[PDB]
Amino acid sequence: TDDPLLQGRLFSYLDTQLTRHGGPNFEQIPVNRPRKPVHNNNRDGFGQQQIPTNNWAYTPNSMSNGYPMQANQTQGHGFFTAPYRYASGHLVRQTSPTFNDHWSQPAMFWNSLIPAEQQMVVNAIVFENSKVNSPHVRKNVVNQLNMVNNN
Amino acid sequence: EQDNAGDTIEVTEQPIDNTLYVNDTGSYMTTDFGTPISDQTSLKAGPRGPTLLEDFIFRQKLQRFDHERVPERVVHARGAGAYGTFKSYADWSNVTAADFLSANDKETPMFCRFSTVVGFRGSVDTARDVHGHACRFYTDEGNYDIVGIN
Amino acid sequence: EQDNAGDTIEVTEQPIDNTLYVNDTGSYMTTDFGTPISDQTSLKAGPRGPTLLEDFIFRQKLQRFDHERVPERVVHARGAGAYGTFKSYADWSNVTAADFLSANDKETPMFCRFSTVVGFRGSVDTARDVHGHACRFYTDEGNYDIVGINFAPFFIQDAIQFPDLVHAIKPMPNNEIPQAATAHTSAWDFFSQQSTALHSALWLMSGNGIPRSFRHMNGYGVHSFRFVAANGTSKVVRYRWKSQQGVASLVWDEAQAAAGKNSDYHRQDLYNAIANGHYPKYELQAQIMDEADMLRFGFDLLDPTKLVPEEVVPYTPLGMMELNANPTNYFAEVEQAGFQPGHVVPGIDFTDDPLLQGRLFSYLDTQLTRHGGPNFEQIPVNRPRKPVHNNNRDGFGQQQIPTNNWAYTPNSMSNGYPMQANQTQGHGFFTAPYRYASGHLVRQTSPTFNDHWSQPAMFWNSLIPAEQQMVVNAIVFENSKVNSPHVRKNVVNQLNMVNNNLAVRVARGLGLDEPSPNPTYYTSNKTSNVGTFGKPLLSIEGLQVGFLASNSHPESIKQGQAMAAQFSAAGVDLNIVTEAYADGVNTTYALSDAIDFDALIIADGVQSLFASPALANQMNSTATSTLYPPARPFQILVDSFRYGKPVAAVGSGSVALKNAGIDSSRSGVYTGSSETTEKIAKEVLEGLYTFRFVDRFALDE
Amino acid sequence: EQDNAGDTIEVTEQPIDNTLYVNDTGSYMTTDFGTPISDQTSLKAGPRGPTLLEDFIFRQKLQRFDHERVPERVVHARGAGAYGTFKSYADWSNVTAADFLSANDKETPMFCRFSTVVGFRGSVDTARDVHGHACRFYTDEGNYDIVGINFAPFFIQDAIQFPDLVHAIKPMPNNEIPQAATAHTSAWDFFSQQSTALHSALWLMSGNGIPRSFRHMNGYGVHSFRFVAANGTSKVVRYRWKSQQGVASLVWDEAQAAAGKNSDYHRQDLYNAIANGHYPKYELQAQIMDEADMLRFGFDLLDPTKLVPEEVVPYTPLGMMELNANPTNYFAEVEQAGFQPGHVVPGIDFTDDPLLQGRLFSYLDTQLTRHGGPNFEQIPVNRPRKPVHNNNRDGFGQQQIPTNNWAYTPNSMSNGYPMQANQTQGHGFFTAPYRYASGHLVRQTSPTFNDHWSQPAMFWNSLIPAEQQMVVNAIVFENSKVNSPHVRKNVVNQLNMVNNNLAVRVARGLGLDEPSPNPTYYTSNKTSNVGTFGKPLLSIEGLQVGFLASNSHPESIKQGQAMAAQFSAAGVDLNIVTEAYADGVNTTYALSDAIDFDALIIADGVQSLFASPALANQMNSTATSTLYPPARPFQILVDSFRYGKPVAAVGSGSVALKNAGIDSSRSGVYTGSSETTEKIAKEVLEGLYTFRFVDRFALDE
Amino acid sequence: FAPFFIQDAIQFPDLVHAIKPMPNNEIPQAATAHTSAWDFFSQQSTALHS
Ligand code: HEM
Ligand code: HEM
Ligand code: HEM
Ligand SMILES: [Cl-]
Numbered sequence A: 001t002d003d004p005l006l007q008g009r010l011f012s013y014l015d016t017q018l019t020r021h022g023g024p025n026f027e028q029i030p031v032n033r034p035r036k037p038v039h040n041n042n043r044d045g046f047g048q049q050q051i052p053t054n055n056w057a058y059t060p061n062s063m064s065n066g067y068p069m070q071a072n073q074t075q076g077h078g079f080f081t082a083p084y085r086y087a088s089g090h091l092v093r094q095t096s097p098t099f100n101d102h103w104s105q106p107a108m109f110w111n112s113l114i115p116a117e118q119q120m121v122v123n124a125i126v127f128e129n130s131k132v133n134s135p136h137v138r139k140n141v142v143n144q145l146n147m148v149n150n151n
Numbered sequence B: 001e002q003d004n005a006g007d008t009i010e011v012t013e014q015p016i017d018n019t020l021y022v023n024d025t026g027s028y029m030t031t032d033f034g035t036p037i038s039d040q041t042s043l044k045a046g047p048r049g050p051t052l053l054e055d056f057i058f059r060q061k062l063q064r065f066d067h068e069r070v071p072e073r074v075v076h077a078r079g080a081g082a083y084g085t086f087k088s089y090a091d092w093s094n095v096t097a098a099d100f101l102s103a104n105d106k107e108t109p110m111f112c113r114f115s116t117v118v119g120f121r122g123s124v125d126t127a128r129d130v131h132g133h134a135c136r137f138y139t140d141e142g143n144y145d146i147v148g149i150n
Numbered sequence C, D: 001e002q003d004n005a006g007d008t009i010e011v012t013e014q015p016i017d018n019t020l021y022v023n024d025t026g027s028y029m030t031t032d033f034g035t036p037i038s039d040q041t042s043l044k045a046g047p048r049g050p051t052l053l054e055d056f057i058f059r060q061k062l063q064r065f066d067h068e069r070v071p072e073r074v075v076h077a078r079g080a081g082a083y084g085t086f087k088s089y090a091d092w093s094n095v096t097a098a099d100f101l102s103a104n105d106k107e108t109p110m111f112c113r114f115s116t117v118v119g120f121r122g123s124v125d126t127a128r129d130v131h132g133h134a135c136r137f138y139t140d141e142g143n144y145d146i147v148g149i150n151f152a153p154f155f156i157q158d159a160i161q162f163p164d165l166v167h168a169i170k171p172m173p174n175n176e177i178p179q180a181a182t183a184h185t186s187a188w189d190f191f192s193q194q195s196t197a198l199h200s201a202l203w204l205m206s207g208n209g210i211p212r213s214f215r216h217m218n219g220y221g222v223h224s225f226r227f228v229a230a231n232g233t234s235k236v237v238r239y240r241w242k243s244q245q246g247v248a249s250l251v252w253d254e255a256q257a258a259a260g261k262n263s264d265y266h267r268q269d270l271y272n273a274i275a276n277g278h279y280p281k282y283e284l285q286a287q288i289m290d291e292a293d294m295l296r297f298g299f300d301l302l303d304p305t306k307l308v309p310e311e312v313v314p315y316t317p318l319g320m321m322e323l324n325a326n327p328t329n330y331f332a333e334v335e336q337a338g339f340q341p342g343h344v345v346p347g348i349d350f351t352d353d354p355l356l357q358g359r360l361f362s363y364l365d366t367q368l369t370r371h372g373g374p375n376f377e378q379i380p381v382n383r384p385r386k387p388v389h390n391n392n393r394d395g396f397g398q399q400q401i402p403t404n405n406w407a408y409t410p411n412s413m414s415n416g417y418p419m420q421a422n423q424t425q426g427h428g429f430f431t432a433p434y435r436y437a438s439g440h441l442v443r444q445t446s447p448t449f450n451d452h453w454s455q456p457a458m459f460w461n462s463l464i465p466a467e468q469q470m471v472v473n474a475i476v477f478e479n480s481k482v483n484s485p486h487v488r489k490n491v492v493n494q495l496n497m498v499n500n501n502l503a504v505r506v507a508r509g510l511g512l513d514e515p516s517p518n519p520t521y522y523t524s525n526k527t528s529n530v531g532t533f534g535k536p537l538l539s540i541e542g543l544q545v546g547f548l549a550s551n552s553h554p555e556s557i558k559q560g561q562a563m564a565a566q567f568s569a570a571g572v573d574l575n576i577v578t579e580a581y582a583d584g585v586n587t588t589y590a591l592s593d594a595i596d597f598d599a600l601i602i603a604d605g606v607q608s609l610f611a612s613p614a615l616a617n618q619m620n621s622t623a624t625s626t627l628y629p630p631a632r633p634f635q636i637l638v639d640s641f642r643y644g645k646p647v648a649a650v651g652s653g654s655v656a657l658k659n660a661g662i663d664s665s666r667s668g669v670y671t672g673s674s675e676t677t678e679k680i681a682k683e684v685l686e687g688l689y690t691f692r693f694v695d696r697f698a699l700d701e
Numbered sequence E: 001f002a003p004f005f006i007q008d009a010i011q012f013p014d015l016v017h018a019i020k021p022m023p024n025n026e027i028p029q030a031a032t033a034h035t036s037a038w039d040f041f042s043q044q045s046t047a048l049h050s
């Protein structure tokens, strides 16, 4: 979905795999391998421990007997974006006004805890905000919490 | 390792795919994580629209591409290789305990690479240069490399 | 950050050494950690003993050496760079808020790199190829890079196909053959199965594929971009760098000779020109179009396989660039430089060109590969001229020391620094606000992109007959090297959708059946400034003259030397060539070839050097010169003439011309007695501007 | 380089930005390539639309973030650093040509990092462990690093065994359990099968394994090194950093509590001390021995499992270090710092210690892992204070720009620069010239290394009875966590070769058969300054006092505050603790534990806070305080007393003491009326120096 | 937890730097109990639910 938090995670996690693995072949590590063999025209990179036999590593070509075959909604069980998805709008760096209520759900959550666990939340907030060294931040936290539940 | 329950360790080996040589015959294209794909058009907000960040098919393909290259050799960057075999003329144990030399007609698999020295990866074969002659014997007692020149 | 003692932070800045350029004068050698050393003998257990592990001097030196190399660029690996400056012709604020364009005579520092595409790091300069023209403006509002090429169109219409095009044109994966060339099955297979490629393929087969030098080609942005004004109004623009030297190119067999004689031909040309004060210039120009123009001209401005003809929208001159300094260290400054089309500044924006859109991802990601980590922008050549301030942190190779301990937004601790910048404060980047999208989320190509053949037809019609023959010869050469008959035939059929005459001539060259006219996409239209023969140069500065003399006729050297003042005054290098160095000699027969000179002059009284190979072959073994291969002087002459270069002969030099079957009546052949050398020089200057004499090139239909 | 035009090279240095410390004040946010930005909302196709690939602002920010991390150190991952200065006591040129030691009062900049060994980057400070003490002198002749630990001996005698020791002590490979601890089968298996480990294992089980802070331990070089004089004569030396604060340690259950209450206990201690002006000091000392001393003392000076007893060779004071500034950015300066024992300077040399010899390889190689490339010495904290000059080139992350284009020796082009440096010119490094080797090339251990047990015996005899009990408790704790009976028994048998009493007490703790005396390696010998209890501190600066008060008795706060001037004057922090912040309150019961204070004072009139858990348990649910867990004040008191810390009580505070079963007659218990608080303070100062009252620790045999 | 702290991925490095140890001294470990985290949670009030 167009969840702006989800949308960025899609970039971030693919990129971050480079950092931890030293190179682009992180999916070749056993725990990350799919259970069926991979076939695509990706090649090379540090730590390449496979040996491609298809010497015509591009699409379209007339040399490889059509392999590997393009997969889509109607053949090969290919991935497909949900076809009724739609977008319409200026290209904007603006937050949706539907996102503006930051406090009602915190209030519901508070009401959802037994009295003993409500005390636990208070004790935690008090513990953490006593460790916070800045009085003005302590006061900002209080004011925010007061928009959630006065008690 | 097992005079006690704590140091006793259960090993469950998982049925992980262990392909070496890749054979495309018959196959649909998949990502590196095995999802079947096409790879010929970007996902866009309308046919004349901008490309979407969520097009993971685009990103995985170009990330592979963007990372294909590795440092060339500091010397002997330009070279070419081939596999072969080596046959001992004799049992040479009187002078060497080397196993690949331990019997008449004993055969050992080989891989060699030949190269120039000074030029970078795509430099001309017929440069005036030293030439490398580097061969690996895949022996029963380890890979023995003779890394020589002409 | 200081309403309390705990969050109050004491900053003590340490007096750390901050060298940029390294200057060895006066110094003793030290390790990288500053201990003075020698580095010439290993530490050993006795003078004939084994080397010791404790020899840290040995290990630090070889560890540096063992780690010198980094990955080359996946494309455009082979290239060369230079610094320069850009001057705006005007205040362009009426169309763009870009700061480097905001005032008449406003100057901005520049760094550019030029390259081929397909060959690896040490491949030959004169490969037939696309050429990169990538320039960074170090503006006051960030590094702006125009990452262009010497052809107006590109091969494909979507970035997702880029690895397909590249694997197809690169050497085959089983054996890594052939180097730096499209002359193989896979490339022509791709160009014929992916018929978007035809426009750029024709460019590649023309002289545009084999330029004389980086100084004698133009640059193109290829894609539509946007100029965005302060108030949000945008224009759609296409960039051209118009070379102020002019456009000039080689012929194929000459490009081959150059590859074997001087693989560094273009990088040497650029280095020498700058070092000699002949600074190359290129005028920045833009076709400045309205949003309403997207589909008006019968193709789509989002389509990178299509140029806008100058005759439909003229190029508006924006300003002038000049390159005026060589780099100090090639690895540090050129090899490590990373250009990105996503390096934009306020007042510039993108379009929905699906080729451009993917480049924006690719170039940022690829910088990791070549630099080993995320701090590639911290490398000096990639730094902006003003200090960076943001909340990015850490990563391999971090050589800065952040002092802002509250590295997040929003915060109440950092006094609002660094401040958010946008359209209305701090000169922040902004997307053009009238841009809009509307549609299903689709992996479909636009039908406006479907005509792959009409523009190839226009391009063909835009070449003089001699260069049309060059295209045929190239296609025939490359497709003869293609090993697959079916691919050869596919190429013919594709070419027949472009122009029947073209396709018939190619099929004839390939020994294939001649196709019949297929008029759907044919046109008589043509455009200007897209060819490389038939139009003279605008400047001959930094071109080369070879003056062929002999030590066995000493007056010939003096004759050469007395012409030198005139060439020098035109910024042309006169090279006196003999058998061996001597007083006044610049270079030798053994070192020389036709490719080394843009014009050739034969001295008076040296005709006996110019024996043909046949004559050479009679007298072999004894009393044949050892100082150069048999008939080297003759070959220089015959080659120069064949390639179309101006040739002059003084006095009995005309005997050499006759020996070579060159009539003194041919265009671009100058003769005179020893008393008229001054006039012969000026005719050579004339011929250098014309550059090539196309009447020498064989024509067909 | 200039006998000709071709080899003459024009250098044009470009005006590139050269920021080190980054200062955000006044600035707008920019990308890394200098374009002004906001960074708070993704670019989307409509406000509820998908994020666009062209949002380069999003991608550059997350790419930086996604790449922030680097590999931690394979050992000593968890650590903290600070800058300081070193002052020589003398001109030491009679024994060493080292430049930082060449004059009385000569000052050299310093950077040190202290660490544990086994735990990963975010493991608990108060793990039982070896501690690193690694210091760089930024000398005029290169960066000299002493990379030491807080124990005098090391576990193994050959560097090739280092991965064995480390894999054995690190978490098990199947499940990565347990963290930061030797309390598992593999470690004790290793220590018992590789009996060289016994000396260091005893150190580890003593208070030395759990120091109070980095400021309250010593440092040791462990290995023999050499001082080399200008004329080539050498001395064999061993280094000790003698803490000028003194040596003090925790007890195990306290180290555990600290791990759960404040994992940053030692790094916070060091940061706060420096920030508060209480700069830690350590005196550099060396046992300065003759070459003839190698085997004289009944063990081998090449052997790193052996200390030289101060009573055999005294430590010669060389100079004083002080650490006086915190780093500005932890990642840039501390995380990236790379110490190497091979970072030596002229006047220092190595010995044939097989443990030292391998470290010289290992640390240079390991820097590649953590920095992603070979230019790790170019990181600011690793740079020498004078500019580097050598012919090393290139590599990932090259942020310098060499100007010497003739980067090889010998050459005739560079004017002899940089010049070779050696013993007799340029202050070059030189191996000590009388060093000699003679022998077959052997993979054999020296028989001089065979006594693994005598020095462990000396160490045991060197501990007060209370700390001997601590060693037994630790061994018993760790070997109860060891899951393998046969390893437990091997450990006992090994310990029985050291001291029968030790081994019997351990076997009793483990429920095993008691071994019988095995006198071969037993000794009554002992050495001084190797224990951590029974000897007072030399300075109490930067220690902490907790003053337990209550908001429900307001005069208690005022009582606390009136004592503050006296503690402040001693450089001791007085922390007033109540239920919740209020005028004059420093911290709260809920935030507090015994581990937070080095001494505890109970205020007059607050006795009712100090209800025991039993009393707490009666009245549960309503009217029990929510402001801290039940019996928190009582627990602070009982814990402080158990751990051996000084405790004082004013007035009715003595009621709290009685509730806790603490008689006012015990050592390190101070009581007084409200009129004698000044005297109570000075007794607390007294108790802080004694530091722990060992009469409280249970003893066996 | 069912909800997350922020509504846009571009803010992720902000949330993370805020909750991670301070950059000058890398204190404190594995904890939000410090000025920066609670500053972030209170200036970026989307964080209250989580
Ligand atoms: C007898 C003299 C030498 C010979 C016969 C020789 C031979 C070779 C050969 C044949 C290669 C290419 C191997 C391949 O095809 O991949 C090579 C690479 C190399 N040589 Fe040498 N070499 C010599 C001297 C040295 C010396 C003295 C050094 C440095 C101390 C050295 C360092 C290297 C390095 C770093 C490589 C790159 C290897 C790689 O990246 O895999 N060579 N040498
Ligand atoms: C209009 C079409 C294009 C033009 C004009 C163009 C231009 C260039 C140039 C001039 C360079 C060399 C820059 C240098 O000198 O360092 C380059 C490198 C590169 N190009 Fe392109 N390019 C185009 C299409 C693409 C596409 C579609 C992609 C991929 C989506 C791409 C990916 C790359 C990559 C990965 C590099 C290596 C950059 C580096 O390592 O720094 N290019 N391109
Ligand atoms: C006398 C024995 C030893 C002492 C006193 C010692 C000391 C230290 C210290 C203090 C550190 C942390 C430096 C820092 O704060 O960054 C360290 C790290 C290290 N030590 Fe040792 N060590 C000893 C033995 C060894 C041995 C035998 C080896 C291997 C042959 C070794 C390999 C390492 C490595 C690889 C690191 C990581 C360094 C880095 O990543 O920068 N150590 N050692
Ligand atoms: Cl959605």
Ligand SMILES: [Cl-]
Residues within 6 Å of the ligand: C302, C350, C351, C352, C353
């Ligand atoms: Cl658009």
Ligand SMILES: [Cl-]
Residues within 6 Å of the ligand: D302, D350, D351, D352, D353
């Ligand atoms: Cl020695």
